[PDB]
Design a binder for this molecule. Structure first.
Ligand SMILES: *[C@H]1O[C@H](CO)[C@@H](O[C@@H]2O[C@H](CO)[C@@H](O)[C@H](O)[C@H]2O)[C@H](O)[C@H]1F
Length: 312
């Protein structure tokens, strides 16, 4: 193969990226987006704040732009995200009880219906668990609705879109630990009771040199529950500036993550969280850290590019 798209294509897998529609007007950005991936997900265009900026007033512009890009270039489209505690507009945060529940059911219904037949899989609920185990406590959904909100989301999404794969997504659930254990219990429960849930996504926002040694083992145990698994927001950050050793380790880290996926038959593929280091969300959250993506800020391929090629 000569592009990652070709390598993932031959492996029978997905290799995607987080798209900011506003960047498509930068030729180098578009050139890479067109050539190297076979799947696309909206970085921000499909979240709650960008789609229902005010109660019952949907804004599908940015979202449609991403959905059009995928259809026009023949890429699979992944949806992100229906229910999520962050980027929740204040009108929602001010809602209470059944009212809040109705706003949630309606948001899930409208957004899923609008993209029906275009989005192949959705992160219906994202980041429901707390590091350390148990439910996230700082979530308006958990507070206002209690434990059953997740099941309600999945049931409402399945009713609006009969065929989209419905996934639950989280971070720090890559290795076997208290967070992935709680995640595992919930999936087992859902499958036992017939709650519609088809896949589990593992964000994989990792640190260089710190890739969980039991990644494969963990993906496999979820797969055994009869669900598909996917790596959804992969980037492996470092303390900047980067150097020859930091880039070499990161390469090897990319290789390990992709091989974990290649080794679990139900691992659908891998989605990196962006294309180039220059637009990466990392420096804005973790000051002092960065250089986490496969292309540097000059659009030059970092050693990671060749590692991923090999893993596929
Ligand atoms: C996976 O993690 C990424 C990184 O935070 C999330 O995407 C970021 O979300 C924030 C908040 O909406 C945006 O400001 C960033 O531009 C975006 O990269 C993603 O939603 C998540 F679930």
């Amino acid at each position: 193969a000569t592009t990652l798209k070709e390598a993932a294509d031959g492996a029978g897998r997905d290799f995607g990226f987080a798209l900011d529609p506003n960047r498509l007007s930068e030729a180098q950005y578009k050139a890479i987006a067109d050539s190297e991936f076979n799947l696309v997900v909206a970085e921000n265009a499909m979240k709650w704040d960008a789609t229902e900026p005010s109660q019952n007033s949907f804004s599908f512009g940015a979202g449609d732009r991403v959905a059009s890009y995928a259809a026009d270039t023949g890429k699979e489209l992944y949806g992100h995200t229906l229910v999520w505690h962050s980027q929740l507009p204040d009108w929602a945060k001010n809602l209470n009880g059944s009212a809040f529940e109705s706003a949630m059911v309606n948001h899930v219904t409208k957004v899923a219906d609008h993209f029906e037949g275009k989005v192949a899989s959705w992160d219906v609920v994202n980041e429901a668990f707390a590091d350390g185990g148990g439910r996230r406590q700082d979530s308006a959904f958990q507070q206002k609705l209690g434990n059953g909100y997740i099941e309600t989301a999945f049931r409402a999404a399945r009713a609006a879109d009969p065929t989209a794969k419905l996934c639950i997504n989280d971070y720090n659930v890559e290795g076997i630990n208290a967070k992935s254990n709680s995640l595992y219990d919930l999936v087992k429960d859902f499958k036992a009771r017939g709650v519609p849930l088809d896949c589990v996504g593992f964000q994989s926002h990792l640190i260089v040199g710190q890739v969980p040694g039991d990644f494969r083992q963990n993906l496999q145990r979820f797969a055994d529950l009869g669900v598909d698994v996917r790596i959804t927001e992969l980037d492996i950050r470092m303390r900047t500036p980067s150097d020859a050793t930091k880039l070499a380790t990161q390469a090897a880290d990319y290789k390990k993550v992709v091989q974990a996926c290649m080794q679990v038959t139900r691992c659908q593929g891998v989605t990196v969280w962006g294309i180039t280091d220059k637009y990466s969300w990392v420096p804005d959250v973790f000051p002092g850290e960065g250089a986490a993506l496969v292309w540097d800020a000059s659009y030059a391929k970092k050693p990671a590019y060749a590692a991923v090629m090999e893993a596929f």
